[PDB]
Structure 1
Amino acid sequence: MVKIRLARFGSKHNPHYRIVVTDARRKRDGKYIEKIGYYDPRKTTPDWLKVDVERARYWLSVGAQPTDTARRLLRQAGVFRQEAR
């Protein structure tokens, strides 16, 4: 099953993650289907999370179950939020 998860790309003691779509089974840092924004757990910058909503929305729309930390990060950039009445 396709997942939306994190791929570490930092250094040692410098974790820098990358939100990605990929087949369940690939190496944590392997060939990924599509990148959908980065995430920096230490917040060394005013912009330690970007997402590109509309893509992620697409991928969820064909059931790319995302990991737990990923759902959280997605939620935070409001991939899930609706509106009004």
Structure 2
Amino acid sequence: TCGLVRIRLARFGRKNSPVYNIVVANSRKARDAKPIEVLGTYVPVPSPVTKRELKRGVVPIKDVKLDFDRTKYWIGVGAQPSETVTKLLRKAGILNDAWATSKNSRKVVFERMETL
């Protein structure tokens, strides 16, 4: 990543139980220091799905909470997302494929869908 202002993940939770804040942080401050802003949360463990529900065909859910309007503001003023945050924001529709990379570059089984 580059720049003074960066959107990255700050680790919370216990050992073997990671959770994360999506935060706007100064590049120099420690990973778990109090940031400029806490944009959201990210739980890397998918929600368990029952075996019968796997027969049904549900996909396990990875939960992300996020303030979209403020995140777009921080992207706008020049804050630089990390790789994991870049992946998260690309799949939320905030960022487009221009932020993809060569390694990260396929048939769509579902389409990004916004509900109220």
Q: TM-score range by the shorter chain?
A: 0.7 to 0.9
Give 1:31 deviation, angstroms.
1.5
User: Do the aligned residues in 2 keep the contact of 1:50 with 1:77 (CA within 8 Å)?
Assistant: no
Q: Secondary structure at the match of 2:90?
A: helix
User: Do the aligned residues in 1 keep the contact of 2:44 with 2:62 (CA within 8 Å)?
Assistant: no
Give 1:3 deviation, angstroms.
0.2
- Out of 17, 20, 36, the position equivalent to 1:17 is 20
The question of 1:79 aligning with 2:94 is answered yes
TM-score normalised over the length of structure 1? 0.86
State, as a whole percentage, how many aligned pairs show the same letter: 48
TM-score normalised over the length of structure 2? 0.64
Provide the aligned length of Structure 1 versus Structure 2: 81
- Which runs of at least 4 in structure 1 moved beyond 6 Å after TM superposition? none
Q: Which runs of 5+ in 1 are unaligned?
A: none
- Out of 76, 82, 87, the position equivalent to 1:67 is 82
The root-mean-square deviation of aligned C-alpha atoms, in Å, is: 1.5
Kindly indicate whether structure 1 or structure 2 has the higher relative contact order, using CA contacts under 8 Å at least 6 residues apart.
1
Q: Which runs of 5+ in 2 are unaligned?
A: 49-60, 97-116
